[PDB]
Design a protein around this ligand. Structure first.
Ligand SMILES: Cc1cc2nc3c(=O)[nH]c(=O)nc-3n(C[C@H](O)[C@H](O)[C@H](O)COP(=O)(O)O)c2cc1C
Ligand SMILES: CC(=O)O[C@@H](C)/C(C)=C/CC/C(C)=C/Cc1c(O)c(Cl)c(C)c(C=O)c1O
Ligand SMILES: O=C(O)c1cc(=O)[nH]c(=O)[nH]1
Length: 366
């Protein structure tokens, strides 16, 4: 049940959201997290939540998705919250402002958010120095089952997308357990076209060459993060390229540019990517498809609308080895992490799984 879950979800978060504009709230959340001003994460991770994937041990399979800690300011606070892994970014090569404010919108009636941040980023150099300041602390955390992902973007005005990603691999690759080639932001003109077969093969060949050129101890896994809005053709092409090139994994999915029938929020027709509950099943179905297309041989990090243990287990059974959440944190606060983990453990036991690993892709074997 938990007292603070109820307190954060029913009282504290909705009260604070009533007082603070969305981006002000985001900024305050990053600040509070970075300072460790967080409730006591009392959930002890059980052995049945441990997952071995991407050349690493993950103490639990619940991560924070990209876009919360864009500039790597709150990594340690996020582990304190009870996340099994942290992904920072997206980070662009040069600093850039992103879109004019306002650029984030709450849809409380839908338990959703729409954002059009447009890759606001401190840039590679700032983030590099921030990560270097805690590099050995991270090495110990990783060893202890708490890996770090770095999500790479491209600048708005760059004339060579592949070179932007290559720069990211060179600069932040040595500080990351895994890198994410984010070709699925809905908020950068032309970006999602990099998901097309020919463009993706060329781009990923260059990214993988740059990764392979790093020293062994500094050589991260490379994942591609994909949209929920892809055609069947697009998904077939991505699966083919992933297998051809030996891409280490997929992150499924980014936000949607669709607006599902039934959205109630006043701000439903704002431009941007939609996240949270209305994305959940679209993301789950995309995980399911990508798992089948890759014959279950390519690790998937499942993301989109995870707010409960059931949501997490649905993505795991569809083929995810790990899951992430973001929007649920914005509505329910830090206790949501312990909630998801406790519920997930209980459901695994109820469905006769020895642990998370046993449940990965279970629906495909029914
Ligand atoms: C405000 C906001 C900013 C985001 N920024 C990024 C980003 O910089 N890079 C990225 O790959 N995904 C970004 N995302 C997408 C999330 O990583 C995630 O894929 C998506 O929100 C679905 O998960 P959720 O429903 O749990 O939020 C962002 C999402 C939100 C809501
Ligand atoms: C769990 C959390 O997000 O932050 C904790 C540390 C907290 C007590 C934050 C206070 C400020 C609030 C109410 C933040 C909620 C919120 C939001 O309301 C919105 Cl709209 C966004 C985009 C974010 C992005 O992180 C967001 O955190
Ligand atoms: O910076 C953003 O606008 C952004 C990037 C991304 O990958 N996904 C998203 O929803 N927003």
């Amino acid at each position: 049940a938990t007292g603070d879950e109820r307190f954060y979800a029913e009282h504290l978060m909705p009260t604070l959201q009533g007082l603070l504009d969305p981006e002000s709230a985001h900024r305050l959340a990053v600040r509070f997290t970075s300072l460790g001003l967080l409730p006591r994460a009392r959930f002890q991770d059980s052995d049945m939540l441990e997952v071995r994937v991407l050349g690493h041990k993950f103490r639990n399979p619940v991560g924070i998705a990209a876009g919360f800690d864009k500039h790597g300011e709150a990594v340690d606070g996020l582990y304190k919250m009870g996340f099994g892994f942290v992904e920072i970014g997206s980070v662009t090569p040069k600093p850039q402002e992103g879109n004019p404010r306002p650029r984030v919108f709450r849809l409380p009636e839908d338990q959703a958010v729409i954002n059009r941040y447009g890759f606001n980023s401190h840039g590679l150099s700032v983030v590099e120095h921030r990560l270097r300041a805690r590099q050995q602390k991270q090495a110990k955390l990783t060893e202890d089952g708490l890996p770090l992902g770095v999500n790479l973007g491209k600048n708005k005005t760059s004339v060579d997308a592949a070179e932007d990603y290559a720069e990211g691999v060179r600069v932040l690759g040595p500080l990351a357990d895994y890198l994410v080639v984010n070709v699925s932001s809905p908020n950068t003109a032309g970006l999602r076209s990099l998901q097309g077969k020919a463009e993706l093969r060329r781009l990923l060949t260059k990214v993988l060459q740059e990764r392979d050129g790093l020293r062994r101890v500094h050589r991260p896994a490379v994942l591609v993060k994909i949209a929920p809005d892809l055609t069947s053709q697009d998904k077939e092409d991505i699966a083919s390229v992933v297998k051809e090139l030996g891409i280490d994994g997929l992150i499924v999915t980014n936000t949607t540019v669709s607006r599902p029938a039934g959205l109630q929020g006043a701000l439903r027709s704002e431009t941007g990517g939609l996240s949270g509950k209305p994305l959940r099943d679209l993301s789950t179905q995309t995980i399911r498809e990508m798992y089948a297309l890759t014959q279950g041989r390519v690790p998937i990090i499942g993301v989109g609308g995870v707010s409960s243990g059931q949501d997490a287990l649905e993505k795991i059974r569809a083929g995810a080895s790990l899951v992430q959440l973001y929007t649920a944190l914005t509505f329910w606060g830090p206790p949501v992490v312990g909630k998801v983990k406790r519920e997930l453990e209980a459901l695994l036991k109820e469905q006769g799984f020895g642990g998370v690993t046993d449940a990965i892709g279970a629906d495909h074997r029914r």
